């Protein structure tokens, strides 16, 4: 009783280690396409069915021309992170894993790297290191009549990390394809007029109505483990890792009122590793000034980290070495995931100071859950 | 002897029922694109490889501008049903299933619904039901200088129905993609000049030469069964259903002469569920007045339903609650499919009263046949 | 699993009852009144045999006393003659508790066409809207009086052949309660610019419109002459111990481009879902919505569709579209049944959200009396 | 030892034969587009995933108007072969096969046909055979104010030939698309001014600056084998054929000096079937007069065919029944492919007589190599 | 396989040594000179304990004596103050033999950020480039003198915790040799249009630039007070019998759109690979390359990537990009180890190839003293 799982854990970990030691990691291009967003913006990519799939690195480039006669546009807070609006992955058994927004996926990529994802840090080095290759790049502004070039990368995870295969997918089933759906930005989502909500946009400004994509291009690279190890009983595989879902999902909630605790409940069964809360205060994104405090509480009137916005931000600076954009708040629960079974119902709390019309909290979650 | 098939039938039906009871039906978007027909009109869609695929619901919208200085155009008899010129589906084994015209597919969608496909019936209800959502819609005329908006839907079937999986496709083979090819209308097929054949066109009239598509957009939704049931021997599956092809195909035949029986033979092996015959009388489509009678005969000079056009139309009114467009004739053989093996050669007969130059019969068939 | 035996028996008993008993539809009560004095009535059904449902006939005369302005039917029109209905069985257990408009939309969904409507055809024989079964003037001009007729079927049994949800009333003397709340001079007329959701007419002359009177007649449908056997009455015990109810609710908190999820409760087997997008008093034909869907936690959407494609599925069910802003979902063959509260939710991702926006939900479900 | 490969060879050949005998060859259109080069010239075609893919026949047509007021333009030596500037193919595993110039691909098409690709030979026949269909065609000159029409075809090979499936691609992986990238000529590459380098151009002359494409159209036809044969162990397939790459690639080298051997080394591992060397003598293309001799040598100061230009050309006349254009030299090593492992390093040699400024050798190779 | 026992023992011994000995960093030699007279020096390390590596500090003053033209730092700048380094252990066996710039890039790869750099932050407290640890003027104007400082870590041991490659020098009196070749007036300055690969400054005034002087100080890092046991010194025999070396090479023969493959040798366990595309003196930010990869014969590529995606992997390793035309590949967790010469190769498929193009390779590897 319960000892069977203690054994299962060791067997799973043992097999994970053997797989990591014996297999060979491969990153391979699976598809590349250049398109005009005016014609199409939704694509369904069919990755290869080889060994254990760890994730996908998605490269996105775009050329945007601001055709306005006189006005410019400037990057929104999320900018190129909004080149992909939504990403959804389905495994060979047609089970959904990650299903979230490009901006949420990007903030998690940053959280897991411990710094702005794939960024180039600035130093005093006289040797010419720096932003040489423009891996993630977008012009701060695009003047009237100008064309800007952007590059963005997203890592869509299946496995939790390079050493923790929890969430990985065994794609060996012939005739049963995986599916990576990408819903890209287009001329209706990428450009926000002055005064409009910039949340999902790339550029905002007085020239927005005349901005257009010349083209968008994407290349999907699939990362997997080949040459899987075989034993007496055949393929040595961490069964728990491969039967666990590691997913990112987002949601929206409204109903905030000044000085009243707004509580977003965590669902049961899911083990929440991180939580992101974006306070879209009716299109306004503020640097903590519209919030009294944020917290996580296990009901029973018990906060584990009720903090003023600046102190909450301080905890985040310890995790990613900088602040997330205005109105974006992060919470790390990786070592002790929020799990309602072992702590009772828990909720994420925001007590707003100021609430504009159409205010809402956009939540992003990272979690583990059993397939069955 | 022959008892093996009697058992196979029961096993197939039993498994079909288990699959229907245990699986979960899903309808999911697989691709959406907006394009200019002047640049391209043929697309190859790659659907997802998940479980048992039942069919595809294809949404098509378009904006058409009549740039003529003075003349209008009016819908042809088929109208928006001609937004898709041809549809062809190939399964993972690269076997062709349906391969037909958009107009034929649409008439079969109507026949199987028992009323004009996805239409809104008119009633005396004071409550505001009606054509609220314009699911299938097209302006009757497009004036000189005006732009009309159209919406059309087609159901491309694999399975015969929601409860009869005959024809369904098991798409689990990784690396073996299905293919749904769509050949859309364009500026050369959609607009017929006065006096030209309107068969494949959407609009016809004195302003036709100056009509053009501003754009066409399509969205393909895939309907399938997920969470397939497993048993002692693995996946429980109706092997006969999944190894049978349910296809729609069309053809053209010429050589008609006044008062002489024009006979179109049914091929052997195929089990014909329905037959559609369109009398394209050299570009003229008449309401039965150019026909003496229609029939189905098992050779051996034996008609099973030799009828005058109005009486033939009466049988059809019992099936779809109205008449098909001028010159379009329908025949239901669903309960007792035409099968040459069990009745000898059979043919569809039209004895024309009047025959114009370039007259021909366009035939549309719905049938079941064995993969092997 | 002695369930197979229970279900097998239940079904057999149902068939014997349908085969042996005789259907009766009988008037139980009629009343005429002035909404200015009263609008809530508690009808007492007859306690006889197995009760299947109630057909409620409502007629009304509305006078537009305005000097010069007319009013016109709202989208729901006469379907708002009854604002709410509640039914309590002899054991004090509630079955349906919903709005008149939701009840009407379910009546339509179950018929497969606008409830009790007259279809238009090319027939030269004079079939047509001869009897004005459900009827209301499109407009009532200043100084005019319009006559309206509306019918509602309050179901207990699921259908004429499926007695799930039916009520055995030959039982105790304990009374049934069919509560009806009718429209009144405060709910039936909406001023220009006001929310027309619960109103019958809207327009410039609304402030001066009033009911001349309202009348209702309730007909009770039941099975009499129940079959008897060895142990006694042959009865489908599962059918009679199951509740078939319609219920409504309201949810708010919608935000542009964000998924608004209405969770389904556990225990209930949801047969259909209706969601009305009351966009701050505006009712649009899908243009204010990105998509609708039904989703299971950690298994994504089973039918995420654009508004027109969602409407296409509905056209296959009722042969037309429901009124603007009204969305229907059929789950009859495979009822939504979570087992865990919220394992499944109804989703609406709005494109535009006005002030005071909300989703008015309507549900049809089965649940055991437990 | 080494005997396993001798068996593998026989198994591979046996399966190849079964596949050829049992499958059915199909050539099918996959995409057609008409475009204005001023708007776009690079396209990425997604072919169908059916059976074993042998190659693609690409039809290209164009209308070119010479808007110059007074001067004409004339075809360059390569002419319509420069309608496609570069072609690159990627298989489902995202592995690159052919990656070369349109002119190189065309010269190889010619070499493998044994005569100018898809040309019409001239004979004394009184029966009206001849250039009836203008399969590959381009007007010799386009006068001031005139519009010329061109047609060009390229065969992009995967399989080596119709009977040798070495290089063919198994495209059955659902969700893993192949990609055929075509970079077409445009108004900046197709027209060379007098004195400019004509290498990549279609027309050259005094009216070049005013020449423009009215349009370019392409149609890609995919050739493949359907109805693949199945055996006890499933699909019978030549594993060596399908795991070998048959590619064409080109490169450029400079640093030539009069009377000094210019040597271009062959890389190891690749089995080189043919070599093409184009002596772009600073924009001048001469009929051998700027070369002392050409050769192939296995280092160790050992030439296997050191020949004067005319004698080298004589060997080529035996292969394609005519000469390649000025400055284009061909070498057939099909029966005994250049392989550095079995002969040591080998190089292609050109000893120039005259060397202009900006001289270079453009090399084109045809080769086989292992995927792994 | 008594290897498990050997490795188990080696690792235990390593831990005892790290736990029991004491780390020392000590100056072994300093010298100031004029490159016009000499630029090659052979430093003699101290023979004490287990030697882990050498920290080499180099300072220089450069005078631009040109009348009116300035010069500016090349991409490598002060990293070219040392042209080459070679280390010989007491047994006459060579370990590292590479260029100063390759050594510097590995120092950066191992640190996970530009070696000994000062990161810029928003801190109001005055942290920053206070001490100019690695520093050089961006430009030196005509008539000006600039002061430069550069540091290099020549490793023997792989890291502070992994003694693989370390050298036992308490052993024989036989001397160690740390050979250093410094930049001189012929290598440090590149004229406009000349190849700047090995230079520190390039520009119109280059011909008249010269070193005023160069100074170096070598610090030796070692472990003293080695632990003794029964048989004597407790030592990780595998660590001390393994060589951890950096080496460079040059390859030519690149052709547009053709795979250029640099084979890896057998026996060596390659931890990292650096490839510099010296495109005839031009250094581009990936625009002259189609893709890079690592490939095994008859098993295709394990990482065929476009230049930007290749750079993305590097950004995860050093938090920025290496200079233009410099490409890095980390194989630390699973070192390239062929067993058969050339079973694995490093691939570069160039888009454009200029005259005198070549790839300058740099490797980090482990190999047994055999």
UniProtKB/Swiss-Prot annotation, chains C, E:
Q: Which GO terms describe its cellular component?
A: viral capsid
* Keyword Nucleus set for record: no
Q: Name where it mostly resides.
A: virion
Where is the protein situated, by its record's location annotation? Answer: Virion
Q: Name the keywords, alphabetized.
A: Capsid protein, Virion
Q: Which InterPro entries match?
A: Phage_PRD1_P3, Phage_PRD1_P3_N, Viral_coat, VP_dsDNA_II
What is any Pfam family matched here? Phage_Capsid_P3
Question: What role does this protein play?
Answer: Major capsid protein self-assembles to form an icosahedral capsid with a pseudo T=25 symmetry, about 66 nm in diameter, and consisting of 240 capsid proteins trimers. The capsid encapsulates an inner membrane and the genomic dsDNA genome. The major coat protein P3 and two assembly factors (P10 and P17) are needed during the assembly of the virus particle inside the host cell, when the capsid protein multimers are capable of enclosing the host-derived membrane, containing the virus-encoded membrane-associated proteins.
| Subunit composition and interactions | Homotrimer.
Provide the protein name.
Major capsid protein P3
> Per the UniProt entry, what species is this protein from, by scientific name?
Enterobacteria phage PRD1 (Bacteriophage PRD1)
The uppermost taxa in this organism's lineage are: Viruses, Varidnaviria, Bamfordvirae, Preplasmiviricota, Tectiliviricetes
